[PDB]
């Protein structure tokens, strides 16, 4: 289940590792486009804070979700910033959301005083007075409900079926890093002149096996003249030794 457009839900993602190959390779992702970032370069960039927005919309207003658009759903339920960070993913799901007897659970805002500020997680269900004369109590002339329930049926074709859309937005190195892409881990070569990159310690030499004690309190050895001569393998606890070629 997804929250309705007027009251879309937001989930917070931080302090975890995100893999996008499973995101990229999934078949039913129809609309997968990004503006500020490239989809293929998301596996090697660190994001300070990631939060996602989920909702279900019709097939006609899929275009209006783009930044800079104006519409009854792009201005009265959710507005995008002019400088929109991140991107959105949209697809058609007529199997689940659509109901044979009529799915009326989803609603959207019709009438409002003005366009809402971008990134607003608030909603008001108060009645709307169309005329200038004050109105209150029960709905009357020039007094109508500002929300309409979605009409989704399995018989409805393209442009009217429900669409599940997720919005991903994040900062760019404006805070201590929380979520980062996975790092490659190749095999280990012993007794050979290689270019090691142990946990970001670039260098050159040959890796051997040493008997120095590295209590896990320690992490990284050195020598008298302050030159690296011993490292600990991150994959396995064994301690290696480094001597120049």
């Amino acid at each position, epitope marked *: 289940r997804f929250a309705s457009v007027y009251a879309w839900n937001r989930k917070r993602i931080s302090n975890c590792v995100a893999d996008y190959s499973v995101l990229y390779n999934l078949a039913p992702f129809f609309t997968f486009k990004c503006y500020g970032v490239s989809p293929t370069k998301l596996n090697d960039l660190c994001f300070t804070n990631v939060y996602a927005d989920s909702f279900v919309i019709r097939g006609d207003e899929v275009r209006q979700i783009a930044p800079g658009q104006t519409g009854n759903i792009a201005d009265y339920n959710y507005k995008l910033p002019d400088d929109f960070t991140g991107c959105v993913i949209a697809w058609n799901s007529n199997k689940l959301d659509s109901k044979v007897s009529g799915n009326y659970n989803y609603l959207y805002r*019709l009438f409002r005083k003005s366009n809402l500020k971008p990134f607003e997680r608030d909603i008001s269900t108060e009645i709307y007075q169309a*005329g200038n004369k004050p109105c209150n109590g029960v709905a009357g002339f*020039n007094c109508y409900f500002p929300l*309409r329930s979605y009409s989704f049926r399995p018989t409805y074709g393209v442009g009217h079926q429900p669409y599940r859309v997720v919005v991903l937005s994040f900062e760019l190195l404006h805070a201590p890093a929380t979520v980062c892409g996975p790092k490659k881990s190749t095999n280990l070569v012993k007794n050979k002149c290689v270019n090691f990159n142990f946990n970001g310690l670039k260098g050159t030499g040959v890796l051997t096996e040493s008997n120095k004690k590295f209590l896990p309190f320690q992490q990284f050895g050195r020598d008298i003249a302050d030159t690296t001569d011993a490292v600990r393998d991150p994959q396995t606890l064994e301690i290696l030794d480094i001597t120049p070629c």
Partner: antibody
Amino acid sequence: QMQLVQSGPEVKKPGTSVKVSCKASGFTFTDVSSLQWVRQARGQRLEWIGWTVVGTGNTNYAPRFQERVTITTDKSTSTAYMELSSLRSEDTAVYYCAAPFCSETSCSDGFDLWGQGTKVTVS
Amino acid sequence: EIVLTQSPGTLSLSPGDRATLSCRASQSVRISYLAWYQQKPGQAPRLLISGSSSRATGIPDRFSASGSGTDFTLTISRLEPEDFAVYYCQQYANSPWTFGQGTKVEV
């Protein structure tokens, strides 16, 4: 201009479904506009059938008109279709459609616009 | 489902004189959602006062709206020869609407 055109007077036989409409030239039903339909016989006071809201879709009819009259307002075509059945001699009258000047911005509490009407009779 | 009565039914006043008409309803006290229309034989009615305080487009200043209760009164300063029509009070209660009986004026 803010102008409305209705259909023409017609003569029909009992037991025939009747489609009644009035269109607006240059005026749209948008999202806020509503519209009411009234009837007037020969030398009789006006009688109100029903008024419907184009935006929300709420339909309200007369208590005596809950069985055989159907009013549908289409914003895309900006029209008001009425399906009417069981037209006896009491339905021989002139139909009028009234709408307020209300296009997405603001409007008052009255129906300023009025149609010239269709003189529909059934023998 | 509103029983609305308009008085007087028939009027015979000289042109240029001041006249007043009233309409009453059996429903609750209602002021700001009652409108007056004048209609001609063979011509569609046109709104003249709505909201009990506002006017439509092109409405002459002769029409005056008064009444604080259910009674709604329309006052005309001068009966110009085109004012001879039938008057109808109509409600906006969202309840079943019912037009008035009709206030007929003749020379």
